[PDB]
Structure 1
Amino acid sequence: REAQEAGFALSTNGERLELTGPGPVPAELSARLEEVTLGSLAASAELEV
């Protein structure tokens, strides 16, 4: 939803996560992308625990 509001499409590939669009992604959008990826990986780690 945040990416769509930013004008970019979210392309999920499981653990790997990236944004497809013209030129570099917005800085705040990139930061939120990294935070969401880290949160998903933390969910995976807590899932293993």
Structure 2
Amino acid sequence: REAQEAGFALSTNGERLELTGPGPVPAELSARLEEVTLGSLAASAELEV
């Protein structure tokens, strides 16, 4: 939803997430992307536990 509101397309690759668009994405958008990915992998670690 944030990527759609920002005018960018999300390109999922399995469990890996990245944002594709013309030029660099906004800094807050990149930070939110990194936080979402890190939360997903932390949830995966908790799933393993």
Percent identity of equivalent pairs? 100
Give SS of 1:19's match.
strand
Distance in 1 (alpha carbons) for counterparts of 2:43 and 2:12: 16
Give the length in aligned residue pairs: 49
Distance in 2 (alpha carbons) for counterparts of 1:34 and 1:46: 18
Structure 2, unpaired ranges of 5+: none
Distance in 1 (alpha carbons) for counterparts of 2:48 and 2:25: 32
Deviation at 1:15, TM superposition (A): 2.7
Structure 1, unpaired ranges of 5+: none
TM-score, normalised with respect to structure 1: 0.92
Moved over 6 A (4+): none
* Residue deviations 1:9-49 (CA, integer Å, cap 9, x gap): 11111232111110001101000000000000001000000
Distance in 2 (alpha carbons) for counterparts of 1:14 and 1:39: 16
TM-score, normalised with respect to structure 2: 0.92
